[PDB]
Each structure stands twice: as structure tokens, then as C-alpha cells.
């Protein structure tokens, strides 16, 4: 049970890491840059997640 | 001419049922005996479309938005509908797109059109050697300041009157993606008394027009002053929405079945497993 809890906790906590982007929240990146410069950073989030 | 009909009444946007309508070839790739799921602007199955008709002292020709995409379906014996009026302001103020199929070719002109209050044409003294040829053109007296002109290829359409069951069906899909006009067309014979026939069919593309003008509204012209009337005709107006269909291609490449993913919860399972047979389960 502790190993399952630690696995789920790691799985959620990994969402806060930036993975090479400016920030971890997708709404701040989609709310600032235009879509053509934006596809490289979302693709970096996609490959990492 | 200036005044309208005393019996003219605007009908409300009544609704009817549309079963298998709205399935077309989404792209230009040919495929055989596979199941492809695509995303494009579509007409949802089992949706509501406007219900219009004409019978033997009511004429309704309103203005509707072209915004989210449109679907036109006309069931007519003598092919009353020649074409449509496209544009933002739909008048001489701004540019307007006019497409006309005269049963020879498809005439496309963008000009400044002086608008007559009652557009139509006429055929007089048909008693001997009918032939249904065009006689007088009363829609527009003059045209100028033309920014675009196009003439399409010669086509085949039968305007001759017939007897018996409905001999013709015209299915057209009109949409604009990033300034690219995508026109889809289907013509098939049916056996029908009243209503819509039970069946399934797919629509083929017609022309690709790189015009690129913003069109927020559209109109319909009817061609068959108080003594003149309009004949019996029917047309349907659907609304396109960006849905996702699961298409079933047979050995000949035609679309023999279509499953809308978000339509029903059984079809949600059909779209998750990518098959037309869903094994039992949650």
C-alpha cells in the first residue's frame, strides 16, 4: 500500500516539473505565445509527460 | 415589384429528423476495406435541420448565417434552385459571391449587383416545342466593378419535367477552411413518394475555389406582379459542427456505413475500440 501511494504521489508530483519549458502550466504558455512558436514547447511537454 | 405578397408569411425555423445525412469523403486519399477515424467539420447524425416546403400562397425565403458551416439538401423534380447568393452584406455595398448552375456549366462572378426586389426568370409560350430554354433574365439589369470571374467545366443536368416518383436528389456540402472553399456534391436517383427515402449515401467533391472572402450569411434564389407565384419545391439547411466519424470502406472504396462517435453511448464504444462490433462490457 505504501509503494502504491508513493507511486501515485510521484505520478502527480511529476506534473509540476517544467520538462524544458518556461513553465509547467499549459494555460500560461497557450495564453502568451502564438501557435507556431508554441508547438515546439508543447511538443517538449508531450514527449516528457 | 416593390411591395411583397400580401399572403407572404415568415415561417419559424421548424425542425425535422435527419438520419444518415452528412457523410462525405473527408480527404483526397483513396482507401479500401479499412476503418479510418477522422476529424473535420461535420453534420452530426440524428440532428435537427430546418423543415421547409412549398405547396399549391406562402413564400418564405429568410436569411441565415453561414458561420459554423452549412449543409444544403434539395429534393426537387424540375430543379427549381439554380444557385445561391454568398457574401457578408449580401448586396452592392461590399463584394458578394454568386454561383449559378444553368444546367450547362457553373458560372461564378464577383461584381456589384444592382438588386431587384423579386429575383426570378421566365419561360413564355411553351405550347409548341417546349424544350425549357431560358427566355428572359429579370434578376439583374446591370453589373460592374467585377473583381473575380470563373466559368466551370460543362456538366450534365436534366431540367425536363417527368412523371411518377421523384427522379432527382441533390446533395451539396459547403464549407470554408482558412480561405479555401471546399464544395462537395452528390447526385443519385431514388424511389420516393413523400418525406425522405430510407438509405445511406456518400458525397463526392465538386470544385476547389481559392477565393477567400469572409461569408457570414447566405441566400437562396428561386426560379421556376401579384399573378406570378412559386412552384412546389423543398430544400433543407443543416449546420456543420467539428465532430468525428468512423468511416467503413468496402472493397470498392465507397462508404457503405458511418458511425458518429459522440452521437450515442454505444457509438462512443465504437469510437474507442475502432470496430463496428463491440464486445460486451463496461
Amino acid at each position: 500500500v505504501n509503494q502504491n501511494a508513493q507511486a501515485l504521489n510521484t505520478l502527480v508530483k511529476q506534473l509540476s516539473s517544467n520538462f524544458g519549458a518556461i513553465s509547467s502550466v499549459l494555460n500560461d504558455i497557450l495564453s502568451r505565445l502564438d501557435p507556431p512558436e508554441a508547438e515546439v514547447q508543447i511538443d517538449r511537454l508531450i514527449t516528457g509527460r | 415589384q416593390c411591395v411583397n405578397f400580401t399572403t407572404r408569411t415568415q415561417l419559424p425555423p421548424a425542425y425535422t429528423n435527419s438520419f444518415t445525412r452528412g457523410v462525405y469523403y473527408p480527404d483526397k486519399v483513396f482507401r479500401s476495406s479499412v476503418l479510418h477515424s477522422t476529424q473535420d467539420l461535420f453534420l452530426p447524425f440524428f440532428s435537427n435541420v430546418t423543415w421547409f416546403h412549398a405547396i399549391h400562397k406562402r413564400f418564405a425565403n429568410p436569411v441565415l448565417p453561414f458561420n459554423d458551416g452549412v449543409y444544403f439538401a434539395s429534393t426537387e423534380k424540375s430543379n427549381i434552385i439554380r444557385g445561391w447568393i454568398f457574401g457578408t452584406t449580401l448586396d452592392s455595398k461590399t463584394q458578394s459571391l454568386l454561383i449559378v448552375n444553368n444546367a450547362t456549366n457553373v458560372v461564378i462572378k464577383v461584381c456589384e449587383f444592382q438588386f431587384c426586389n423579386d429575383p426570378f426568370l421566365g419561360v413564355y409560350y411553351h405550347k409548341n416545342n417546349k424544350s425549357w430554354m431560358e427566355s428572359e433574365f429579370r434578376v439583374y439589369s446591370s453589373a460592374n466593378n467585377c473583381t473575380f470571374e470563373y466559368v466551370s467545366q460543362p456538366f450534365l443536368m436534366d431540367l425536363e419535367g417527368k412523371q411518377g416518383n421523384f427522379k432527382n436528389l441533390r446533395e451539396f456540402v459547403f464549407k470554408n477552411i482558412d480561405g479555401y472553399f471546399k464544395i462537395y456534391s452528390k447526385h443519385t436517383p431514388i424511389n420516393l413518394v413523400r418525406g425522405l427515402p430510407q438509405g445511406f449515401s456518400a458525397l463526392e467533391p465538386l470544385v476547389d475555389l481559392p477565393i477567400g472572402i469572409n461569408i457570414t450569411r447566405f441566400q437562396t434564389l428561386h426560379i421556376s406582379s401579384s399573378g406570378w407565384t412559386a412552384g412546389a419545391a423543398a430544400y433543407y439547411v443543416g449546420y456543420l459542427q467539428p465532430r468525428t466519424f468512423l468511416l467503413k470502406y468496402n472493397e470498392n472504396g465507397t462508404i457503405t456505413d458511418a458511425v458518429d462517435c459522440a452521437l450515442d453511448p454505444l457509438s462512443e464504444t465504437k469510437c474507442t475500440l475502432k470496430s463496428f462490433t463491440v464486445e460486451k462490457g463496461i
Partner: protein, 295 residues
Amino acid sequence: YQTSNFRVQPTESIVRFPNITNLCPFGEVFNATRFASVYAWNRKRISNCVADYSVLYNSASFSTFKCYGVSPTKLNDLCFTNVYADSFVIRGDEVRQIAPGQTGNIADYNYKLPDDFTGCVIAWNSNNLDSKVGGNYNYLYRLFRKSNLKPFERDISTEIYQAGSTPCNGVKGFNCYFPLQSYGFQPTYGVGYQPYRVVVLSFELLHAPATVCGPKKSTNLVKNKCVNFNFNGLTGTGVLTESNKKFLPFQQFGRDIADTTDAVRDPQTLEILDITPCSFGGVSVITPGTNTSNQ
């Protein structure tokens, strides 16, 4: 032990396209007397794969070359459907505003290139031709508009509309202004105010047939072997066989479940050829121990 992968290499190369009808006008439109404004741009649809290989000004003949993908010299093996020549005149500092999906004054308010644009952006210095004494008021530009324009959308309206946040109801007045403006081109100042006629070529890749490819035409067909074929711009290696595949008259080629080339049609005559890759497989070595025998 598994070592390498045996593969049959193609012996020959078959590129098959019909006879040349006519040739596209690339330099005839370059010699035109005058172009339209930035918002009024003239478009000419002239199809097929190959325009003209004899006369090519694409190499260091003009003022400014900003290209994406490949240059016109490398376009001779690539077959495309539509060719749209767009003509408009800009100034020197607005060359930087032409690029797919990027903003700007002329990008947002006049014309922005779509993200599907694969062509080259061609500019030429008109100061020895289009320039006039005291400024050229013939060309125009729309500096202000009520809303942003999507890629490939044209607004030719020259009338007086809302400029700022307060509508003035048509005719000029009530602290509004006339949206359209004109260029001030003067021959004696620097590059930023120098006119550049911009001709851009927008490409769309579809399945429609091209009737003209290269100086060579027939290259007689050889079937039942793996060869390098280029048909309508698709280069691959496989066996050309006849099949029962039924294609619609306007559909040139099909694809399989792996989203790879399945069957193609002859652009020259009426035929349907199925692409089946030539047989290959692995090589297994049955050998004893090194201390026993080398067989």
C-alpha cells in the same frame, strides 16, 4: 545468430509523365507593367508539375531571396497541383513581415502567409521603374482595420469605416480618420523606403494529375520488378503489377493501413498499378564452434 538483413536493390528507374502541352508564365508576369496594391493582389492559377527549366532567374538574379523548403532549381523532380502567383508592392523594412504565422502591421492588417506555405518569397528592387518624382500615389495600403485577418483572406474595401474604439457612423468626421493610406516613395533616401515588388508562390500538394514533367517524357515502363519510380512527386521502391483496384477518375493514388503508398495510377495513360515491395528477409548463419571448423 542474426547478422544483417538481405535486400534486393533496384536495377533501374522509371519516371513516367505525358507530353508537354504549354509552359507556365514565371517570367512573363515578372515583365508586367504594374501590380496591384497590397490588399488587391492579383492571382493567376496556372497548373502542372514543371513550369520552365530553360529560363531560371532563381539563382542570384534579384535583390532579396527568402525561401523555405527547397529552391526552384530543386523543384524539377517535385510535382504539385496548384500554382498561385500573388503580386503586391511593399517597402524595405516590411520584408521582415513576410513569414508564415508571424504577426506585424502588414501581416495582421493586410496579408499573412499560412502555415501550409512551402514556396519561396521573391522580391525585386523597383526603384528604377516604379519610383516617381514627388512620391508614387498609385499604390495604396490599409493601415487600420476593425479586426484581425485570418491567413489567406482578402478585404478590398476602400470606404470609411470604424478606426478606433468609437464608431463615427460612416462618413469621415467626429474625430475619426480615413483608413487607407498611400506610399511616400522617394528615390534618394535609404533601403527602408525603397519599393520591393513581392511575388510569392503558394503551393498546395494534392492528388490531382500533372501533365508536364521535365525535358524527358516517355521513359518506357518496365514492370514486375523493384525499381525507383517517381510518379506525381512520390519516390519509392517496389514492384509494379496490375490489380483490380478501382479508383475514381480524379483520384490518382491510394494508401494502405500503414499510411504508405499502396497503389498509384499512370499520369500519362489510364492504368492502375499496385505497389508491392520486392521480397527481402534476414540472413541466418549455421556454423559450428570456432575450435571445430570454419564452415
